[model samples]
Target: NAMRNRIEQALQQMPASFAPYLRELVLAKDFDATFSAEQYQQLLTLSGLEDADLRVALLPIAAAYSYAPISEFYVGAIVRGISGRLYLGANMEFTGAQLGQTVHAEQCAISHAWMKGEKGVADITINFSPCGHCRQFMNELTTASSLKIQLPKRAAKTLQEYLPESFGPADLGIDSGLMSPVNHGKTSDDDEELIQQALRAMNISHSPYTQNFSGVALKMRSGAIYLGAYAENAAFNPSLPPLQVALAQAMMMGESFEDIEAAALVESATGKISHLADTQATLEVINPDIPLSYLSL
Candidate 1:
């Protein structure tokens, strides 16, 4: 079926020698657009390439997931977590949505790592140089000071080198940055499953600037649940909302907007910002009849 075809298409863009192994991994239940540390180590040996070169070589596989209808600029990024796992990300643009809603490949990769509970990003490899917006977004990482950036045909450089003297959470008197763990407290006694899921996601949300720790949980008609937590950037404009993050995960898993049966948002009760209106508006675009349940804690 559809999942098989999708996996085959993605593998087609990767190296012929790596496709079979990748196919097996992609079809696994635990595969969530990631390569486990062991799998990556094996890939390094199989490809007979240096660590960095192997990462660079996998760029095409990531780019194959891009959904850039507006810009037609397919960008891909792979982030290596401190645990050695590799997460894939690609640019995603929604038609008729504001340009600002577009997800950059770098942001997608970093958020992918964050959602997967990565402690910190060790490095990132992209098909192209990180854009200025992406550089600013990356400055908020817990590992920003030493995070390496690798691009094809260019020498590797640190994010510090790309964004010298960048403004960050520390500038705003915030001690922690994105991917740094923060407990937002426990949820209510409500027994609703989706609500509990959203609350769990909200507990881990990264929002140092606005303190609007938030999360979104989407229940697909097919019974799959995807959760996303707010990830704030030092520069507010680059922040990724919980809904967008959740939607991106759904898209990567081959679920369309119409497949979303229920949506819920759990946000800071007294935060400076609100994602209610925006979340409702976006869901309306997906399906006017799709209702969004909102909760503040």
Candidate 2:
């Protein structure tokens, strides 16, 4: 509550550059603000800062800041600008930022604020961790790969509890590149039906046989990616329905399943993920040997 109240307080006192920034946005003039709440929220969600007082320490973030006197830095922003990439009404002129807490947001991407409220930063760091979402995000990475990154506060954490005994393409016999395509082939347009079918069937996930909360990630050869989460019901009858199987079946009708790329599951409560949980790793499912780019899911 303190932090939330603090944010409100900051909004009232310390303040954000909202007025000046919005003026520039309206005028299409040069500005200096590098972030907005939407972008930060998306970045947090993508990075897995779901809950608890995130270790809000300084992040030596780097990337481009397209405001007044547009400049780039080595370590100043964590949420990179990807408006040019989003399909749903994203403006190429829109803004984003590079955010980082004390730890690498990618390390424990997708955090959720659990029990703590007014706790001190030190107490939470020593005692808390990244929730399921953060772990879900981290499942995308087996190790931290950046240099010049330092943990300001142990905000992103809980890599273990979030995603446990999870399987990646690696565990699924993908190592030898020996995994069979669940779907042998399908077309790009046909893939949409496959994805829709997969989503519909996702309700059939059998969670009783396995505790993993599943998701559906579909992609086209063009690299367009979509993600979804499994919702649990009160029936206590666990299942993934038929969504994934449906998509696989669609591919069976002559479309190449190779384009499905990087499908995964997210920890229901915490946001931690299984190995093939995002566009990057799920796609990595096909090209398991190549180094991945940070820009991808």
Candidate 3:
């Protein structure tokens, strides 16, 4: 009976309760409707939180998507149907959960938070909750990144919002606690082998604009995964490193910061182990803000 009801509910096709501000999104959608939809979704989610101070991001023109896709949330909701991909893995069927979980911070905004879909339909309301895939993803995300702990340095609405004060190198005495859990997870292999991979990846990167190399690693409760290649520019003066974000992402995979056996980063070409070490030492000395001495316990 329960399965039947669930199936019956799936047959009842209806839009989410909220209405989309078409006027606000039509222009934004000219470039990417999906992005506009995501941002609008965020806008409603945040606004509903009633924490008026919190702000969702607005989508930049599509010819140029922003580094993060969440800003599109600045608009309101969308009232329409969204199509999704289904595969031969399972018998053909319709389940809304897939669509809800697939939305990412990169779509049109960088939401540090997640709002699981819930019940509000027919005789059998279908709570469009996150699927196992997304649940695992979010679990790893929170454990590794502590999304709720901080306002997040990147794509955050404000400074005071940064949280979970204890993360990555700063927590491990590596350097700044500022590194993200994603984009920066370290590897088990020697720094030499790791640097080589990044060296190769950079050569073919399709970015026709800037050219700079930054490789980073981390040892947190999560084990080593060696992420290289997230970067920032002098113009932005970012608080977090891109490589570190990559590392944290791995840490989120139920990888404990405690499992992090090693941590590091490489830059300035040389890619030589000695060169990398020398550069790291210099960076630590110059920016004693975190004070390696206090950290290197």
Candidate 4:
């Protein structure tokens, strides 16, 4: 709580407009969009710091964008990728659903970065000490060994310190980590553009457990498209389904699922569970009227 004073002091200096603008952007980008040069300039002016501390201070602000119906506890995480891009993620909980359905703040943050094509993450700033599940989640990152973890007032820690005897992607005889990409099965050239984007996401998705290799594409009425890659977890319960991930980004963009012109899920032909029914089930959760097309490679 000692650092609360500094965080509050920083917030007091920025205009109320800053938070709203940031939340909208973060949501629209599925919590992984980069700040434009102009946007970064505004952030620099608002937070009064260059890059390092700016992201740390922004963590709480990101937490504000969370949708937590269960605990009402807002936790946020910011991951700085190798390109110096900062990806934002906040805890999301499902009300009346099984507790295991909740997405941890750290899982959201790292998945956000990975889906956005980040090859490696350098540092992560989080609002609180990561739970055991989250520490294990972080261990799956490609850069886990060298990743620096920071809390508001605590000394930095490496993934090694947090997870001494870790089981990761490699433990399963898989060399790739969360941030690493894989070569998935073939895709149809019929849908062309949409399928291509979906395939790109699928190839990059982390699915060492099931090797499901799936991605979702949301084609906007405006002809623009946003895609989400399936990210699985070792716990097997915290995985981010492609539909939920894509829908989360679309809703954040202030677009309705009803407004989505077309939605599709493309995945490998071989897998324990094809996301076919789960994708439709998630759409039912979002809006029963929304249609989802399922495709297998």
Q: lDDT of each prediction vs. the true structure?
A: 0.83, 0.27, 0.26, 0.69
> Could you tell me how far off, in angstroms, the CA of residue 50 lies in candidate 3 after the best superposition?
20
**TM-score preference between candidates 1 and 2, better one:** 1
Scanning candidate 3 in windows of ten residues, the lowest lDDT window is 85-94
The reply for model 4, stretches above 4 Å from the true place, is 1-33, 36-52, 96-100, 183-185, 191-197, 220-224, 251-262
Most lDDT-accurate candidate: 1
List candidate 2 segments past 4 Å from native: 1-10, 13-128, 131-137, 142-297
lDDT per residue for candidate 4 within 117-183, as digits (tens), equals 7888888889788988888777777788888998876778898888788876666666646777566
Q: Which residue pairs show backbone clashes in model 1?
A: none
After superposition on all C-alphas, the RMSD of every candidate to the true structure, in Å, is 2.2, 18.2, 18.7, 5.5
Best by TM-score: 1
lDDT by residue (1-297, candidate 2, tens digit) is 322242233234311333233223322423212333364454445434442222232121111111111122112222221221110000001012112111122211111110001111111121223334333333322131111112344334333434567543344333211111122121223334434433332333323223343445455464544433332212222211222222322221222444544343323232233323333433343455433222101
Candidate 1 local Cα displacement, residue 237, angstroms? 0.6
How do the predictions measure up, each by TM-score? 0.92, 0.24, 0.27, 0.78
- TM for candidate 1 is 0.92
Better of 1 and 2 by lDDT: 1
How much does candidate 2 score in TM-score? 0.24
RMSD, model 3, all Cα superposed? 18.7
lDDT of 1 by residue, 21-107 (tens): 876787677667889899998877776778888888788667767777788888889999999899998888877667677889998
